[PDB]
């Protein structure tokens, strides 16, 4: 990871970036701020191109749709906690998800949003904003403190609070047992495994496949080919001063990257040529751009 350059907030003594995503066509870097702004930076020039008032509290997380038309945001306090923005011609709010502190798009066909409110998952239609499903089974709850509900790659399944759901029947098919207080887990992009903190479970048989100690208290994101996994341990900054890369096929670590600055977020471009990391220089949180490669 070869550092290239830094994006900082123009017209501020201290930078206040909290999260990052590349635009679908990688023209711009979208940066959320601690004041609820979404700032667009030209990747080539480093220049701030727009600053949009999205929330009345710090933005925590962003997700652009693959087709470039939509953006999800989540914030910290107050209402709405999450929202869907149109990215075509005029930047505007399409819908709000008032109660949900985290939101993701569906994966295969991006026609749905999944939101999380504590132990509960909400699925919404993108066009209508209507709530299609509520997924919560009190007999299977793990009550994970940092629960984040997610679709699998085919959108047939959801993981919510370590419970596997069949979306089509809206029935719980399996509870993965609780071995940590915080992390609820994700689907591997390979479609075969679920990664819940340090445990790698077989999605089909539910048997334990691997123990991966380095993943304890980590959030993860994959490169776009699903060959490399990035993990950063939750701790103020959401993360510590390091992230680790892993071989996605065998969960063996590749590199340990200590930036010696607390991390707020990281993202890669669709081509995985670039890595952007929000790093505290101080709060003075800048976006450092790296060559991957
Ligand atoms: N943009 C992404 O998805 C990437 C992801 N970033 C977050 O999860 C992230 C950023 N701020 N806060 C959070 C956060 C923290 C806890 C939870 Cl429960 C849910 C969250 F969204 C991530 C993954 C691996 C990493 F190495 C790093 Cl540094 C970041």
From Swiss-Prot:
Q: Where in the cell is it found?
A: Cytoplasm; Nucleus; Cytoplasm, Cytoskeleton, Microtubule organizing center, Centrosome
What does the record say mutating residue 168 to A does? Loss of interaction with DDB1, no effect on interaction with TET3
Q: Which residues carry this modification: Phosphoserine?
A: 237
Please list every transmembrane segment annotated in the UniProt record, as residue ranges: none
**Where's the motif DWD box 1?**
163-170
Where does this chain carry the motif DWD box 2? Answer: 199-206
The UniProt entry's sequence similarity note says: Belongs to the VPRBP/DCAF1 family.
Q: What is known of its domains?
A: The protein kinase-like region mediates the threonine-protein kinase activity. The DWD boxes are required for interaction with DDB1.
Q: Give the multimer and partner information.
A: Component of the DCX (DDB1-CUL4-X-box) E3 ubiquitin-protein ligase complex, named CUL4A-RBX1-DDB1-DCAF1/VPRBP complex. Interacts with DDB1; the interaction is direct. Also forms a ternary complex with DDA1 and DDB1. Interacts with NF2 (via FERM domain). Component of the EDVP complex, a E3 ligase complex containing DYRK2, EDD/UBR5, DDB1 and DCAF1. Interacts with DYRK2; the interaction is direct. Interacts with RAG1; the interaction is direct. Interacts with LLGL1 and LLGL2. Interacts with histone H3.
Q: What does this protein do?
A: Acts both as a substrate recognition component of E3 ubiquitin-protein ligase complexes and as an atypical serine/threonine-protein kinase, playing key roles in various processes such as cell cycle, telomerase regulation and histone modification. Probable substrate-specific adapter of a DCX (DDB1-CUL4-X-box) E3 ubiquitin-protein ligase complex, named CUL4A-RBX1-DDB1-DCAF1/VPRBP complex, which mediates ubiquitination and proteasome-dependent degradation of proteins such as NF2.
Protein name as catalogued: DDB1- and CUL4-associated factor 1
Q: Which organism is it from?
A: Homo sapiens (Human)
Report where the shown chain sits in the full-length sequence: first residue, last residue, total length: 1080 to 1390 of 1507
């Amino acid at each position: 990871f070869r550092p290239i350059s830094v994006f900082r907030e123009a017209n501020e003594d201290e930078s206040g970036f909290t999260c990052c995503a590349f635009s679908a066509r990688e023209r711009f870097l979208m940066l959320g701020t601690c004041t609820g702004q979404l700032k667009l930076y030209n990747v080539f020039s480093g220049q701030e191109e727009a600053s949009y008032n999205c929330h009345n509290s710090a933005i925590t997380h962003l997700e652009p749709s693959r087709d470039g038309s939509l953006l999800l945001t989540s914030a910290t306090w107050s209402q709405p906690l999450s929202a869907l923005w149109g990215m075509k011609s005029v930047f505007d709010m399409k819908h709000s998800f008032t109660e949900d502190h985290y939101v993701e798009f569906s994966k295969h066909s991006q026609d749905r949003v999944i939101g999380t409110k504590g132990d509960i998952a909400h699925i919404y239609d993108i066009q209508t904003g209507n709530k299609l499903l509520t997924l919560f089974n009190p007999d299977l709850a793990n009550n994970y403190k940092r629960n984040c509900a997610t679709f699998n790659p085919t959108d047939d399944l959801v993981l919510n609070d370590g419970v596997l759901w069949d979306v089509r029947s809206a029935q719980a098919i399996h509870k993965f047992d609780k071995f940590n207080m915080n992390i609820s887990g994700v689907f591997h992009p390979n479609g075969l495994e679920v990664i819940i903190n340090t445990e790698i479970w077989d999605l089909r048989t539910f048997h334990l496949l691997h123990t991966v100690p380095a993943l304890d208290q980590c959030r993860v994101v994959f490169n776009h080919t699903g060959t490399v996994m990035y993990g950063a341990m939750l701790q103020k900054s959401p993360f510590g001063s390091s992230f680790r890369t892993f071989n996605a096929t065998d969960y063996k670590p590749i590199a340990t990257i200590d930036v010696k600055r607390n991390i707020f977020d990281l993202c890669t471009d669709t081509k995985d040529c670039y890595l952007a990391v929000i790093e505290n220089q101080g709060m003075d949180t800048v976006c450092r751009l790296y060559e991957v490669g």
